[PDB]
Every structure is written in C-alpha cells, then in structure tokens.
Amino acid sequence: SVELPETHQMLLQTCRDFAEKELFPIAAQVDKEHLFPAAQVKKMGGLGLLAMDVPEELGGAGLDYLAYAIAMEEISRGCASTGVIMSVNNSLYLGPILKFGSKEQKQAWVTPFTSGDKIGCFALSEPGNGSDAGAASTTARAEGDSWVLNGTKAWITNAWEASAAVVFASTDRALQNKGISAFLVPMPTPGLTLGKKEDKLGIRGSSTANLIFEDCRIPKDSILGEPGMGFKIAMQTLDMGRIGIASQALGIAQTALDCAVNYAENRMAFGAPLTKLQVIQFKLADMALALESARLLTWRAAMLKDNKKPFIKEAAMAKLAASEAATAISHQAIQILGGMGYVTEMPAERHYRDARITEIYEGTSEIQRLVIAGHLLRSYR
Amino acid sequence: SVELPETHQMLLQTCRDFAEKELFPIAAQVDKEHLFPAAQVKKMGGLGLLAMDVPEELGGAGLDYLAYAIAMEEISRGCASTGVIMSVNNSLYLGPILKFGSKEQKQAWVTPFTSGDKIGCFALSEPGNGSDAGAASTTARAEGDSWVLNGTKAWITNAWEASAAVVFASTDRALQNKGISAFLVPMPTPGLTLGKKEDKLGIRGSSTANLIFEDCRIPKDSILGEPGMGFKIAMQTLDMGRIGIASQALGIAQTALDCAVNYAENRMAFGAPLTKLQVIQFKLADMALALESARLLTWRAAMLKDNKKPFIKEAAMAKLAASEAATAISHQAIQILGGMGYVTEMPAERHYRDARITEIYEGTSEIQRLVIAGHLLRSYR
Amino acid sequence: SVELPETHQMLLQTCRDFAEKELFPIAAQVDKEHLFPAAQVKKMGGLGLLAMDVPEELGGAGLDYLAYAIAMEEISRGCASTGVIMSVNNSLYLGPILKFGSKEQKQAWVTPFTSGDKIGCFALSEPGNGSDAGAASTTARAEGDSWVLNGTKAWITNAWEASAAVVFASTDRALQNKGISAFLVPMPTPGLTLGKKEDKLGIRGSSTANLIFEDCRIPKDSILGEPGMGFKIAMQTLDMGRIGIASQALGIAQTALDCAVNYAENRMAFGAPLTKLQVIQFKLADMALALESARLLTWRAAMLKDNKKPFIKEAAMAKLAASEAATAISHQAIQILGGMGYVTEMPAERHYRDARITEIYEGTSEIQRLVIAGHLLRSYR
Amino acid sequence: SVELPETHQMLLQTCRDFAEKELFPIAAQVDKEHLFPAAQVKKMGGLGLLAMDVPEELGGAGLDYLAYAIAMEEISRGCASTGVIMSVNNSLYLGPILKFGSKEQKQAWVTPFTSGDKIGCFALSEPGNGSDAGAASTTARAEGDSWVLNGTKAWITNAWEASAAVVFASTDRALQNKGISAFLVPMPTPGLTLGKKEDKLGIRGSSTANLIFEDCRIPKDSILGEPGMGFKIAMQTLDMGRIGIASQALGIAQTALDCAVNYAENRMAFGAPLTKLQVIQFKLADMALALESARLLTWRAAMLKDNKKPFIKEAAMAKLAASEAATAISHQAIQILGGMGYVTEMPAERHYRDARITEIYEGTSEIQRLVIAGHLLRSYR
Ligand SMILES: Cc1cc2nc3c(=O)[nH]c(=O)nc-3n(C[C@H](O)[C@H](O)[C@H](O)COP(=O)(O)OP(=O)(O)OC[C@H]3O[C@@H](n4cnc5c(N)ncnc54)[C@H](O)[C@@H]3O)c2cc1C
Ligand SMILES: Cc1cc2nc3c(=O)[nH]c(=O)nc-3n(C[C@H](O)[C@H](O)[C@H](O)COP(=O)(O)OP(=O)(O)OC[C@H]3O[C@@H](n4cnc5c(N)ncnc54)[C@H](O)[C@@H]3O)c2cc1C
Ligand SMILES: Cc1cc2nc3c(=O)[nH]c(=O)nc-3n(C[C@H](O)[C@H](O)[C@H](O)COP(=O)(O)OP(=O)(O)OC[C@H]3O[C@@H](n4cnc5c(N)ncnc54)[C@H](O)[C@@H]3O)c2cc1C
Ligand SMILES: Cc1cc2nc3c(=O)[nH]c(=O)nc-3n(C[C@H](O)[C@H](O)[C@H](O)COP(=O)(O)OP(=O)(O)OC[C@H]3O[C@@H](n4cnc5c(N)ncnc54)[C@H](O)[C@@H]3O)c2cc1C
Ligand SMILES: CC(C)(COP(=O)(O)OP(=O)(O)OC[C@H]1O[C@@H](n2cnc3c(N)ncnc32)[C@H](O)[C@@H]1OP(=O)(O)O)[C@@H](O)C(=O)NCCC(=O)NCCS
Ligand SMILES: CC(C)(COP(=O)(O)OP(=O)(O)OC[C@H]1O[C@@H](n2cnc3c(N)ncnc32)[C@H](O)[C@@H]1OP(=O)(O)O)[C@@H](O)C(=O)NCCC(=O)NCCS
Ligand SMILES: CC(C)(COP(=O)(O)OP(=O)(O)OC[C@H]1O[C@@H](n2cnc3c(N)ncnc32)[C@H](O)[C@@H]1OP(=O)(O)O)[C@@H](O)C(=O)NCCC(=O)NCCS
Ligand SMILES: CC(C)(COP(=O)(O)OP(=O)(O)OC[C@H]1O[C@@H](n2cnc3c(N)ncnc32)[C@H](O)[C@@H]1OP(=O)(O)O)[C@@H](O)C(=O)NCCC(=O)NCCS
C-alpha cells in the first residue's frame, strides 16, 4: 500500500547512506570538470545497484522495479549524472536483453555487466530524426554470415565508457517500423568510431557522443530476437526508461526542495526568517504538493509494472509530471535563494540545469502527451 | 496496493450502477429547480451509503474510509449536490460523534441517522469569521442545568433538512480556542430559527441557511466530550471532510472529462473528428493526468487514515489538488464543447458551477496551503 | 501616446456617468429575469453610443475606433449583456455595410439604425459548423429576380430584437469560400422563422436564437457587394468584432477587480484587513498587471485600425489576452470574496459567468492562436 | 502613438546594424571565456549609446528614455552581458548624478563617462540584506573634513572595470532610511579593495564582485545631495533601472523567439516542417503574444517617464512582465529546439541562463508585486 516493505525500506536507507557518503562531496567537481565518476560506479556495482532488475542467477540483485525506482530517486538526489548513468545501465541496456535475448546472449552480455566493471548504452536516435524513432536510417545488410552495419547514431549516453551497445538499424527500408532491427554491438569493434563528446547544459558527468558505423560487421548471433521486432523492443525499453527518468526527476526535485527549505529557514530578511513570509510558505506548499503527487504517480507506474500489467499510459504520465514538477521546483528554489542561487558556489543552479534535461530525452513532453491522449481515447473507445 | 479489494470493487460497481440508474436522469432537474432529492437520499440510506464509517453494531456499514472515498467519488459523479449531502452526513456529523461522544450519545444520535431517514449538519462558520474558525462568537452560558446558547451560525448545509446539529460555541471568550465547545443540538428545538435559503451559483440541491440561536437551551448531556476540546474536534472533523470534498471534486472532474471526451469524439470539424486535432489531444492528456494524480493523492490520504496514522498534510494536499484539478478540467471541458457547452441544455456548465465550490468551503485553498507549509516546515525542523 | 485626447476623455467620463447612473442598478435584474433592456438601448441610441464608427452624415457620431473601444469597455463594466448588444450593433452589423455596401444600401440600412430604435444581427454560424466558417451550408439560389434563401443559421445574437440581418449563404457549394455570399435580410420577412431562445450560462439580457430560412426571397439589391467576397467580408467584420469583444472582456475584468479590491479592504480576518495578508496583495498585483497589459494590447489594436494599417494579428492577440485575463481575474475575485462570492446576492458570480463567454464566441482561443501563429510565421518568412 | 518617430526609427536601425555587425559573432566567446568586451564598450561609447539620457551639453546624446529602452532592447538582443553593462552605466550611475548632483559634480563625474572610456557602478546591496535595502550596514562617519567609509558592499556589477562608484552608506543607524546617504566614490582609491569575481550561471561578460571599504576617506564634496535623501535616490534610480532591465529581458526574449522560429521552420519531423504541427504553432503564438504584450508595457512605462509623470507602478509591472515572459519564452525555445537546444553549440541555453537573471536583480518578482499591490491599493484608497 502506501507503506514500504522491509526490503524496500532497507534499500532506501542503504542508498541514502551511500549517497550522502559519496555522491554529495563530489557532485560539484563532477559537474564542473565533466569528470566520469569511475570509482562511484564501481562501488555501485559492488552494492548491486546497477543490476536491480537482473535475477540473482545471472549475477543481479533480483529486486522488483519499485526498488529500482526508489534507488534511482535516491541516487539522483545524490548526483544527477550518476543517476542517469545508473538509469541507462539498468533499464536501457539490461532490460531488453533480459526480456528478448536468448539464454546464451544473456550469459555473454548480462553477467559481466552486473558487477559494474562494464556498462552499456542505448543507440536509437539519429541526427536526422530525434522523436520519429521509426525513421531511423541506419542500415544492416545481411551479407554473408555477418550483419554489416552502416549509419550514424547520435546522442549516445555513456558512449565513451560502454563496453556494449544496443543498436537499432532498419534492415528493410520499405518497412518503416518492421524494418527496424536490434543488434548487440560490442565496443570497441573494427568499423566503429566514437564521435567527439558534446558539451551539455546540465548533466555533465556522463559522456554523450555520436556513434559512427562504417562497414561494421558483427556475428549473426548478435541480433536481438528476430528481425522486425525492433520497434516493439524499443517501445518497451522506452517505457521502462521513462519510469527511470521519472525517478531521476523526483530525486532532483527532492534535493532542490531540501536545499530551498534549509536556506529559507536559515536566511533572515526584515528581521524575520523567510519562512515567516506567507509568499515563501505558499511557494513551499506548492512545491511539496507537486513533488509528492508526482512521486505517487511514479510509484503507481512501478507497481503496475511489477504486477505484470500494462503500464504505458501510467509511465508516460509519471515521466511528464515528474519532469515538469522538477523543472518548476528547481526554478522556484533558485527564486527562493535569490542572489545566492545564481552563483555556482550554491548548488541551486546545478539542480536547475540538471532538471532541464528531463523534459527532452526519453521522449519530449509533446510525445508523452500524444501517448497519453492516444491511450485515453483508446480506453474510451 | 494499486488494485482494489473485492469488497471495494463490489461497492464501486454498486455505487456506479445506482448513480447511472437514479442520479443522472434527475441531476438537471435538481440543479434547475433547487429540489432536495428526498427519495434518492432515502434509497442511499437503504443502501447504507450514508453510514459507511459507522460500525455495523450501531447500524452502519462498517467500511473503511477508502470505500467511503470511492463511494463519494461515484455519487458526486452522478450528482454533485447529492454528493455534498452524503459527504456532510457521513463525515461532518457522524464522525465527531463516533470519535468523541459517549456511548449513550452514540445510541441517541447515530443509530437513527444511519438509516437515512434523518441527516445532520455541521455548524462552525459565522458571518463574522469564515476562515478564522477560532474566532467564533456564539456563546454557551452554563446557567442552571442547561446550556443556554446565544449566537448566529451561517452557511449551514442541510439546515432545512437536518434533524440534529453539531454546534460549536465559545464557552469562554478569553480562550480563543480553549473556550470553543461543541454541542449536539436537536432540530427543531425552541429558541432555534432557520434563516432563509441562499441562492447559490453551483450546488443547488442542498439547502444552505443561517442558524439563529436565541436563548436556546439544551440538556447538559448534549455537550460533546468536555469543554475546551472543541477546536481539536473541529480540526479532525475538518480533515475527514477535506478527504470527502477531495473525493467529490474527483467525481466532478471525472464526469466532466467523460462528457468532454464523448463530445470531442462525436463532433466533426474541418471534415475530421475533433480528436484528430493535436490541441484537443493535448488538452485531454493534461486533463487525464491531473485527475489521476489527484485521485492517487486522495487514495493515499484515505489509506493513511485507515491505517491509524497522521494524515493532515496528506488530506490538505488531496483537497487542494482535487479542487484545482476539478476547476481546470471543468473549464477545459466547457472550452472543448465550445458553443454547446455554454447553454444549459448540455451539462458542462453545471459541472463548472458545481466544481467552483470545492475551492471555497472546507477551507479555502490559501488555508490548505498554510496547513501544508506548516507541516512541511515542521517536518524539516 | 499613453494619454487620451480631450474628446476621448470626455466620452470616457460620459460613458462612465451613464453606466453608473443606469446599468448598475438594473444589471442584476437583467441577468436574473433574462430581460432585454429596451429603455437603456434607446438611451444609448440617444447618446450616439450605437453608431460611433458611423459618419455624422449618415446619422452616426463619426468617432475613431479607439473611442468605440473605450465606450465598449465602460458599458461592459456597467453591464455585460448591454455591452455585447452594443458591440454587435456597432461592429458586426454596421461595419460591413459601411465598408462594402453601396450608398443606397447605406441610406436604407444604416440611417434608421443609428438612432437606436432598431438594431442588427450577424448571421454566420450554423449548427453543423461553428469554427469552420467556410463550411456554411445555407444556400442562396438566384432564381428569377430574387435571391431565394434556404438553410438554418444558429446562435444569432439579438435575433428576437433585430430589424435587419447580415446573412452569409454559399451561392456556390463547389466554392468553399468563393461560394460564400453576404445578404442584407430585413426582419421580419415571409419565409423567416425565429427559433426558440436559448438559456445561457452567462450573458442573459441578450436574446440568442436560431434563424430558420424556408424559401425566403429578398430583392436583388440586398446582396452585399458582389458574390464571392463574402468570406473576406466575414473575416474583416470578425476582426472588428474581436476588438469589440476584447474591450468587453476588459470591462468585465475591471469591474470584477474593483469589487474584489473593495471587499478585500472592507473584510476583516484574523484581526486585520485582508489587504494586510501578502497572498491577497500578490493576487491583486497579478490581476492588475493582467488587466493593464491587456488594455494596452487592445488600445494598440484599436489605434492600428484607426491609422488604416493591418491589424489582424494585433486584434487576435488583444481578444485572446483580454478573454483569458478576464476569466482569470473573475475566478480570483470569486476566490478572494470566498463564501460571499458564491451566492447570487453578490455580483462576483455574475462576472464569472459573463466572463466565461469571451473565450468562445468571435472565434475560440484555439482559432485565435492559429491566426497569431500563421501571421507570425508569415512575418518571419 | 504606436508608431515611432524618425529619430527613434533611425536609432533602432543603427543599433540593430551595430548589434548584428559586432555583438553576435562574439557573444558565445564572451559567455564562454568570461571576457569583458572592452572594444565593444568603446565603440558603443563612440556611438553615444552609453550616454543617451545625458544632455548634449555634458557630452551625452540628449535622447528621451524611450530611445534608451529601444537601444537597450536591441543591444540585449545582440548580447545580454553587454546589455546589462550598458544598462548599469546609463541608468544606475548616470541618472542619480544628473538628477541630484550639483553642477560641479556633473562636470567631474558625467563628462568623462559619456565617451565610454570609463564606466560606473551602483553599490547598494550588502551580504546581510539583499531585498531590504533600508537595512544597509555600511557606516559613513563624518570625522574631520572627510567622509570615512567602513563596510562591505556585495554583488557590485562592473566592479572590476568601474572608475567611479555610487555607494550608499547609513550615516545614522537609528534612521533606517533617513540615515542612508549616497556617496560618489572614485575607483581605485586607498582603503578600497575589490573582492574576487563571482562565477555566475548566466551573464558572464560583466564582472560581479564585492566592494570592501576599510577606512576609505573621500572629500566632503563627494556626498550626493544632502544626508537623508539616500533612500529616495535609491528608489528613483531603481525605477529607472527597472525600465532598463525590462528592455533587456525583452531583447533576450526576442532573440530566443527568433532562433526558435528559424529552427522550427528549418527542422523536418514526420516528413513535414515543425511549423505544420499545431502544438508548435500554439507555442509560437503564446510566445509572440507574451513578448508583444510586455513590449507594450515597457514602452508605456518609458513614455510615462518621458512625460514627467509618476511611473513607479508602470515600471514595476514592466519589469515583472518582461522578466517572466523572457523566462517562459527561453524555456519554450529550448523545448522547441529539443536535443540541439541542450548543447552549448546552439545559443538557446545561453538565452535561458541569461534570461534567468532578470527575475532576481533590480528587485525580485516578489518585491515588484509588493510595489504593484501597494500602489494599486493606494490608488483605490
Ligand atoms: C547578477 C547580479 C547582479 C547584481 N548587481 C547588483 C548591483 O549592481 N547593485 C546592487 O546593489 N545589487 C546588485 N545585485 C544584488 C541584488 O540586489 C540582489 O541579488 C537581489 O536584488 C535580491 O537580493 P537577495 O537575493 O540577497 O535578497 P534576499 O532577501 O536574500 O532574498 C530572499 C528571497 O526572499 C524574498 N523576499 C524577501 N523579502 C520579501 C518580502 N518582504 N516579501 C516577499 N518576498 C520577500 C526575495 O524575493 C527572495 O526570493 C546583483 C545580483 C546579481 C545576481
Ligand atoms: C453567446 C453566443 C453568441 C453567439 N453569437 C453569434 C453571432 O452573433 N453570430 C455567429 O455567427 N455566431 C455566434 N455564435 C456562435 C459562435 O460562432 C460559436 O459558438 C463559436 O465561435 C465556436 O463555435 P462551435 O463551438 O460550434 O465550434 P466547434 O467547431 O463546434 O468547436 C469545437 C472545439 O474545437 C476547437 N477547434 C475547432 N477547429 C479547430 C482547429 N482547426 N484547431 C484547433 N481547435 C479547433 C474549437 O476551438 C472548440 O473548442 C455565438 C455563440 C455563443 C455561445
Ligand atoms: C456552499 C457552502 C457551504 C458551506 N457549508 C458550511 C458548513 O456546512 N459548515 C460551516 O461551518 N461552514 C460552511 N460554509 C462556510 C465556509 O466555512 C466558508 O464559506 C469558507 O470556508 C471560507 O469562509 P469565508 O469566505 O467567509 O472566509 P473569509 O475570511 O471571509 O475569506 C476571505 C478570503 O481571505 C482568505 N484568507 C483568510 N485568512 C487568510 C490567511 N490567514 N491567509 C491567507 N488567506 C486568507 C480566504 O482564503 C478567502 O479567500 C459553507 C460555505 C459555502 C459557500
Ligand atoms: C542528454 C541527452 C541524452 C540522450 N541520450 C540518448 C540515448 O541514450 N539514446 C537515444 O537514442 N537518444 C538519446 N538522446 C536523444 C533523444 O532521443 C532526443 O534528444 C529527444 O528525445 C528528442 O530528439 P530531437 O530533439 O532531435 O527531436 P526533434 O524531432 O528534433 O524535436 C523537435 C521538437 O518538435 C517536437 N515534436 C516532434 N514531433 C512532434 C509531434 N508529432 N507532435 C508534437 N511535437 C512534436 C519535439 O517534442 C521537439 O520539441 C539524448 C539526448 C540528450 C539531450
Ligand atoms: C514517435 C513515437 C512516439 C511513436 O512511434 P511511430 O513509429 O511514430 O508510430 P506507430 O504507428 O509505430 O505506433 C503504434 C505502433 O507501434 C507499436 N507500439 C507503440 N507504442 C508501444 C508500446 N508502448 N508498447 C508496445 N508496442 C507499442 C504498436 O504495436 C503499433 O503497431 P501495430 O499497428 O502493428 O499494432 C516513438 O518513436 C517515440 O517514443 N519517440 C520518443 C522516444 C525517445 O526518443 N527516447 C529516447 C531514449 S533516452
Ligand atoms: C485558521 C485555521 C486554519 C487554524 O486555526 P487557528 O485557530 O487559526 O490556529 P491555531 O494556533 O489554533 O493552530 C494550531 C492549534 O490547533 C491545534 N490543531 C490545528 N490543526 C489540527 C489538526 N489537523 N489536528 C489536530 N489538532 C490541530 C494544535 O493542537 C494547536 O494547538 P496547541 O498549541 O495546544 O498544540 C482553521 O480555523 C481552519 O481550518 N479554517 C478553515 C476550515 C473551514 O472553514 N471549514 C468549513 C467546513 S465545510
Ligand atoms: C477557420 C477560420 C479561422 C479561417 O477560415 P478557413 O476558411 O478555415 O481558411 P482560409 O484558407 O479561408 O484562410 C485564408 C483565406 O481567407 C482570407 N482571409 C483570412 N483571414 C483574413 C483576414 N483577417 N482579413 C482578410 N482576408 C482574410 C485569405 O485571403 C485567404 O484566401 P486567398 O488564398 O485567396 O488569399 C475562420 O472561419 C474563423 O475565424 N472562425 C472563427 C470566427 C467566428 O466564428 N466568429 C463568430 C462571430 S461572434
Ligand atoms: C524593500 C523595498 C521594496 C522598499 O523599501 P523599505 O525601506 O523596505 O520600505 P519604506 O517604508 O521605506 O517605503 C516607503 C518609503 O520610501 C519612500 N519610497 C518608496 N518607494 C519610492 C519610489 N519608487 N519613489 C520615491 N520614493 C519612494 C516613500 O517616500 C516612503 O517614505 P515616507 O514615509 O517618508 O513617505 C526596497 O528596498 C527595494 O526596492 N528592494 C529591491 C531593489 C533592489 O535590490 N535592486 C538592486 C539594483 S540592480
């Protein structure tokens, strides 16, 4: 119900302790220097936080997706870039392989990646089409006994750190979505070149680059599932990723609210603490309401996924509400902090820049509203 | 969890069937003619919907407050005035008596009122002070063996139909809240006169009047609890009423959304259904999300109350979010219907006028935000 | 510039004096009883307020459109239904005849209507299509020497009081807009039947009905301009009407703000006036800014029209901003008044219901945003 | 009226030409490297853009404040940091000296600063109090024939480039505002030390530091006006600065809208340009409406100042509306650009970070709403 089980409570406490011990001292350094936190990722792999959905047989933690959402929220509260790296590795790489790959592919592509030594990446977007995922131009000709890949992916998270890749290329151009086919591409491999890192406004610990495939050949076993199923795999992986991104936005909004409340209590204006002003109280009330409401939606989406029931509309609602709430709460936290919120000495601006991204990737807000509207009208029809 | 138990599902189905059978044909007539639906209230008392929180020993249904929230949402979806009458009788009259009254008072003031033959009313507000509940000017002098009541209450719901009253009068003026004392006043009684009915913008089935007490004397047993506890009784009854009003606003928003979606699918513009337009889809998506989020907040508040845990901040959040969401959804439904939404032939304007009230009574939105802000700052401190 | 000329100032003062003398005592009676204010319309015709754009040669006042906007704002501040009647008679009937009709048609259809004895109506909308104005199904066969009209118009303002009608019927069905042709139809005439009055949520002084044409024949001179120009005539008349409706929404928002400020200063809560609370001050500040900004937009649109320059985007912006600001200000005024705002004794709910309409007729907000977007993209291209 | 005079049109064209020639190529470099654009400031001084309000006798341009607002909007459209430097030098330094200083002080402190070789700074805020300007703790003891200054100012714009300073120190502590006294402090002078530059989220061309006064002595003539008038001088200078900041926010919103519209027309999604989507059109319409509405308010405030009439409420409204509109438009521009808007290669994120500041300095939005509310209630009383 509303309360959490003992395992979930213990995981929440452990994640909060780890976050306050490790991520908070280094978050500013990671943001400023664009430094990939290798040691923190290794420690998270040691704690099993990178393989929560993975069964314990394959080396994972064997936990439900609600526990994953809680851990993602706590980690993103600690550090946003570490949060998005964890979210990518947990959902976007591990989920499709467990859900669709054969047992040999699971053994060869999940077990090394549970320990945290290696991480994965999700390669769907292209420079030509960002939202229209079905219009991917990457071609995968089945010449000989190998899949020859030609094309250029873009915006690939963890491109400079991943040891594997889930690449979606259209085997058949005529088939807009049917042609789409997934492939498990090891990194580094001949024929694959990594693009230059992109300077980003917000999350800067993670490395974002453009994968370029030039006559890249992979063995025939590297195809995920069967040809044609690529679009469905992409959609389901996107739903799970949307749940993860909603958790990340919740964490960002929570830490922004905590910093704002602490500063408002500490700061003195007109001979009184700022909390005595009614405007500040109303701002805090609205922020808390938005944050809690979103958290509820997220938890509902996670529990619906755990009960093996359809959750696409719920996940889209959770992602949209969490992203918008995080942006509004971060903006109001900057406004409450005032002048001190603008300088980089205080962490409010980092929360603002990190919260801005949650409305862009994993489907923009317009795409989320399209999904919600379609499912709503289908429900009434 | 997210799912509902079998009893709750059966109650939801029964309430929906009763609503579609009875309330929908007569809602327009009730709104237009200011007609109190006596037969519908009697049938609801027959179904036990007026005594859900009451134990079965005293003649109630013995159901949890979550079931009460579900039934309130369904009834308010059927008809808003019937919804507010049910909410008043269930929470604001029955709850304080069960929570604080002695067993003899329970037998003499709850058992006749479970059947639906008689209903109660909550008398707190005064013309002088609406939000400042602690500034009530009604005086209750303890002369002789009877409590002599002098004063004028205002805005009393069901004043023209109630057979009992929960009246709060300040026994001690010096004590702003300590002086406040509750009293169980039977109606009609000598010394009590009912004010004229007030024409209202929205809910017009219910009768709202001003109770006037002129030397009204009641026996000494009619006092609820002990003197001084009146303010706490009022606050707890207000929390339960806020949960009920949140359920009512949810019902209004739900029926407005249903009518808007049906009309949008039926209406043809520019050679296409209105749902083909992206603006309509985005409006429907935003409306859906709002309602669902509010519902979760409401259900969380109800479950927290059922588990015997503090729920004041949760109830305030649920009431605020539900009221604002209901107003926004009703306005957008009128906008979607366009010209046909403006005339009284279509039920959109009735939903608008009924949804406007949920931000005013049971504490305005500013008071709710004050409560949320106070509890938030207390949580951080 | 920002200041007003002496003629405009004198007209503003005269309109305000007339409004406070006449419209304010009878506004509640007009709203409640659906009473057409014949005497007030006659007095306005005596003051020349119904023929402001009309040259003095034809019996008008010969004033610029800025003066018309000011007078419309003041009258709608006095009474909303009188405001919409004045707006219809000034813009939607008189403007197209002066702009496109020949001199004989001006003499036979403008000079009697300047005095205020008779008023006109604008017949464009149909039950089939409300926003898609080009899809009108009314047919005008040119049989013999007369135009035979068949079809059914809908939502015609002043249908029960108009002595003339501007009816737009598609002469050629193949021509979606080219077929559209305007006609000056006298009322009453054989073959024309008036539909039943429609009960409306808001403005109820004006009479809204559905014109039904059954073999209605008019002389050949009654056609406005030449066939095919009907759509352009409709668009320009709509622009002028949008300016008028923006002025009306400004008046409604202004009177709502005045009542809210007066009540907030008078009402006492927590031992202080409501204006001492910071939340009330912030609400009043937001309301004020909105109204003033909208007024400027309106005044800019009116001055651009007076200088014989294109004003379509400006008029659309003014109408959209004025309507949204009026709705928000009326809602906040009801919220500020609290319980007393809900009853019909206070005039806040009347302002709410009257302000709701300004987002529906003369093009809904979505159509206004489409016009603004089209003109913006055309400006950049 | 709505149109601009020939001088204003010529100044607008010259400012736009200069902006597109100089500021646009170097804006990204200035933002990235925190580089003070010395050459651009010198060229602006050559064009007279730094001394617009200054009479031509003292070496200024002798232009009205409307021309200053237009030039500020164009320059801030070119580059935001250059815009805020120009705004500070024009209003916050030059205005108080011309308005209150004697002729000798004008000759010794305005004529060298019109040419653009030297610039000024406005020193009011302190680390202790940011919004409560009357609680400044800087002390100015009148020992001997010199004013000995002790205290620490904060957030001083152009602290590392100014050759003069307007410092406000409380001569009399007992007098909260009466004690406040202004002083013209040359820079550099013995006893004055410049604090370290502060890394800021947005505008980074300008240098922001903390002035520290330790036994700084100035001649007796350096006091501006007479003791006690400091608070009034600060308030009037703040009003003029609010007009300038509103112009800057207008420029930022305008360039963000231009970039967003151009990208939306260029980008192709789902086989169509983005402008074909109705959601994009509605976003563009809302952005254009907000921008134009604000621009109007700003121009009204500037013209009211030029006509020697009170403009405090108008300036506060203009600043608030311009800041909020700029933030909303920048956020929507980032959303429209999508993924490409997030990287630093595109200029959308720079517009976002620069537009965030306009709600903080020159009085936060809460202070603006307090000023508007006070003037509104004073108007009704
Ligand atoms: C880039 C930049 C440049 C600057 N340049 C200058 C300059 O040239 N000269 C100068 O003098 N200063 C300058 N400042 C400082 C400026 O005055 C302050 O940063 C800003 O105006 C508010 O200061 P604060 O945040 O410290 O106020 P705080 O009092 O610390 O603000 C706390 C919060 O409480 C709110 N608040 C406070 N009192 C009330 C109230 N009564 N009612 C409601 N809400 C309230 C505020 O709005 C704010 O959100 C600059 C600041 C920045 C960031
Ligand atoms: C009080 C009143 C007075 C009136 N007076 C007159 C009068 O004097 N003369 C006259 O001719 N008419 C009059 N009308 C009718 C008026 O034209 C319509 O009521 C109104 O303009 C819209 O009509 P509709 O709701 O039927 O349109 P509908 O097409 O039925 O509206 C459906 C909804 O879809 C939206 N929509 C439609 N097309 C699009 C699109 N392409 N993109 C986005 N959204 C879209 C609309 O905004 C609306 O929300 C009056 C109406 C009222 C209520
Ligand atoms: C349909 C209806 C039914 C009702 N039924 C009942 C009933 O059964 N029992 C009962 O006891 N009462 C009932 N009431 C009365 C109800 O308590 C009040 O109408 C409502 O809760 C607020 O009262 P008010 O508007 O008079 O408060 P006011 O104090 O007059 O409100 C003035 C405004 O100031 C705001 N305000 C006041 N204090 C503050 C503050 N400290 N901070 C910020 N904002 C503030 C309020 O939000 C409000 O907007 C009913 C009212 C209505 C309309
Ligand atoms: C930090 C970051 C990390 C990323 N990581 C990954 C990753 O790991 N894997 C991956 O595959 N991609 C990744 N991406 C790319 C991501 O898919 C896109 O950036 C984003 O989802 C949208 O792409 P776009 O802006 O290019 O779409 P565009 O089509 O260029 O967006 C244009 C605009 O139009 C809107 N729009 C488009 N179509 C419609 C429509 N039909 N209706 C309404 N509005 C519409 C969009 O919402 C958007 O506002 C990442 C991007 C970023 C910024
Ligand atoms: C555009 C978009 C919303 C929809 O895709 P489309 O190709 O444009 O439209 P479609 O017609 O393919 O959608 C419905 C089809 O897909 C399938 N599908 C769509 N959503 C699905 C879901 N959530 N689960 C399962 N199947 C789904 C349906 O089965 C249907 O095919 P059918 O006709 O055989 O039943 C999708 O590409 C998208 O989500 N874009 C944003 C996400 C993103 O970029 N994330 C970045 C990762 S960080
Ligand atoms: C104004 C208002 C919000 C708070 O009341 P106040 O008298 O103004 O302020 P107080 O200082 O009394 O509040 C705190 C006190 O009340 C008690 N209290 C407040 N809220 C409580 C709650 N939810 N549960 C229990 N006790 C509560 C606290 O114990 C404390 O007293 P203590 O110091 O002995 O601990 C309240 O009057 C109100 O809710 N008004 C709107 C509700 C309404 O009108 N409903 C209409 C019915 S349809
Ligand atoms: C739908 C709507 C917005 C546009 O009309 P459309 O027929 O759907 O679209 P169109 O292609 O006709 O629009 C452009 C055409 O009309 C003409 N036009 C459009 N707006 C115009 C304007 N403001 N001024 C002049 N001409 C205009 C253009 O010349 C063009 O024709 P061309 O190709 O020969 O140049 C219009 O019908 C409308 O305003 N509806 C809402 C208004 C309303 O109902 N008011 C009620 C009165 S109270
Ligand atoms: C807090 C604040 C809003 C008002 O100041 P206060 O000291 O708190 O309140 P006061 O009582 O002094 O306000 C009214 C007094 O000041 C004077 N005053 C206020 N605003 C004025 C104005 N716009 N023009 C002239 N005089 C003004 C009045 O004369 C009155 O004094 P009186 O009683 O002798 O008539 C002001 O300090 C402020 O604007 N802060 C934000 C601005 C800022 O920080 N800008 C940074 C520069 S980039």
Numbering used by the authors:
A (entry chain D), B (entry chain B), C (entry chain A), D (entry chain C): 31 to 411
Authors' account:
Here we report the use of single particle cryo-EM to identify multiple proteins from three enriched heterogeneous fractions prepared from human liver mitochondrial lysate. Using this approach, we were able to simultaneously identify and solve cryo-EM structures of nine different human mitochondrial enzymes: short chain acyl-CoA dehydrogenase (SCAD), medium chain acyl-CoA dehydrogenase (MCAD), isovaleryl-CoA dehydrogenase (IVD), delta (3, 5)-delta dienoyl-CoA isomerase (ECH1), aspartate aminotransferase (GOT2), glutamate dehydrogenase (GLUD1), mitochondrial superoxide dismutase 2 (SOD2), catalase (CAT), and mitochondrial aldehyde dehydrogenase (ALDH2). Functionally, the three acyl-CoA dehydrogenases—SCAD, MCAD and IVD—are involved in beta oxidation and amino acid catabolism. Finally, SOD2, CAT, and ALDH2 are all involved in clearing toxic byproducts of oxidative respiration.
Butanoyl-CoA and other four or five carbon fatty acid acyl-CoA molecules are the initial substrates of SCAD. We obtained a high-resolution 3.15 Å structure of SCAD bound to substrate and cofactor using 16,677 single particle cryo-EM projections. The global fold of SCAD is a tetramer made up of a dimer of dimers. Each individual monomeric unit contains a β-sheet core flanked by N-terminal and C-terminal α-helical domains. The FAD cofactor-binding site is at the intersection of the three domains of each monomer. Additionally, the flavin ring interacts with the C-terminal domain of the corresponding subunit in each dimer set. The ligand-binding site lies parallel to cofactor and the catalytic site E392. Residues F152, L154, N207, F261, M265, L268, D269, R272, I342, I397, and the catalytic E392 residue form the substrate cavity. Mutations in the corresponding SCAD gene can lead to SCAD deficiency (SCADD), a rare autosomal recessive disorder.
